[PDB]
Copies of this chain bind each other. A is one copy, B any other.
Amino acid sequence: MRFENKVGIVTGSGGGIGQAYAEALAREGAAVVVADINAEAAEAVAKQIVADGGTAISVAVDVSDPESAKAMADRTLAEFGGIDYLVNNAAIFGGMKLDFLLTIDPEYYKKFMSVNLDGALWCTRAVYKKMTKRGGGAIVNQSSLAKVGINGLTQQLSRELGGRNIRINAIAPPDDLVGMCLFLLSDEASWITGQIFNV
């Protein structure tokens, strides 16, 4: 119960490893905001967390949209009174589509690049002043070439966030991830900010 009475937001938590991050946080006492572009999936995971004796709500977010990220943060405040943690796991999985850049749909490509590269930026901007008001916080960026973008972003934000007691780190890739993520959120990772963990 490391995270008792803490508040964490996990983007892309409607499924996959994001869901496991959300569930693990709630298992250890945190109020979790289950944020996903898919509302129904997010609500499904939140409902199971609550049925399991946890605290969670779901929220629809478009991580590529700064205002949708802001709304996610304001909802978390209204529902839980503060924000301690943010896990930027939301991503667009493209796979072989990006092998055909000459013919790929422009709007798909733009959304893919925007979510995967800037998603963590908009969500970080949406939470960091609220965290500061809590006395500090911790953020984890889940990376996915181009993953140097999130590595670069993580180093930059780590410096900009200095003096707020806010740490920010990146994980670059099976419940060893979960263990690593929650560790990077916890107070035992106090010496760690601006670092990239290869998993």
Q: Chain A residues in contact with chain B, CB under 8 A?
A: 66, 98-102, 106, 109-110, 113-114, 117-118, 121-122, 124-125, 128, 145-146, 148-149, 151-153, 155-157, 160-161, 179-180, 183, 188, 191-192, 194-198
Q: Which of B128, B145, B196 contacts A152 (CB 8 A)?
A: B145
A-B contact pairs, 25 of them (CB 8 A): A66-B106, A99-B160, A101-B121, A101-B160, A102-B160, A102-B161, A109-B118, A109-B121, A110-B114, A113-B113, A145-B148, A145-B149, A145-B151, A145-B152, A146-B148, A146-B149, A146-B152, A149-B149, A179-B191, A180-B191, A183-B191, A188-B188, A194-B198, A195-B195, A195-B197
Q: Dominant SS at the A interface?
A: helix
| Contact present for B66 and A153 (CB under 8 Å) | no
Docked complex Cα distance between A113 and B151 (Å): 16
| Contact present for B122 and A102 (CB under 8 Å) | no
A83 to chain B, nearest CB (A): 16
| Contact present for A100 and B191 (CB under 8 Å) | no
Please indicate the chain B residues that have their CB under 8 angstroms from the CB of A106 in the complex.
66, 122
New A-B pairs, 17, CB < 8 Å, besides A106-B122, A145-B151: A101-B153, A101-B156, A101-B160, A102-B125, A113-B118, A145-B148, A145-B149, A145-B152, A146-B148, A146-B149, A148-B148, A149-B149, A155-B198, A179-B191, A180-B191, A195-B195, A195-B198
Given known A-B contacts A152-B146, A195-B198, A113 and B117 have beta carbons under 8 A apart: yes
Docked complex Cα distance between A125 and B157 (Å): 34
Given known A-B contacts A114-B110, A198-B195, A102 and B157 have beta carbons under 8 A apart: yes
Docked complex Cα distance between A194 and B113 (Å): 22
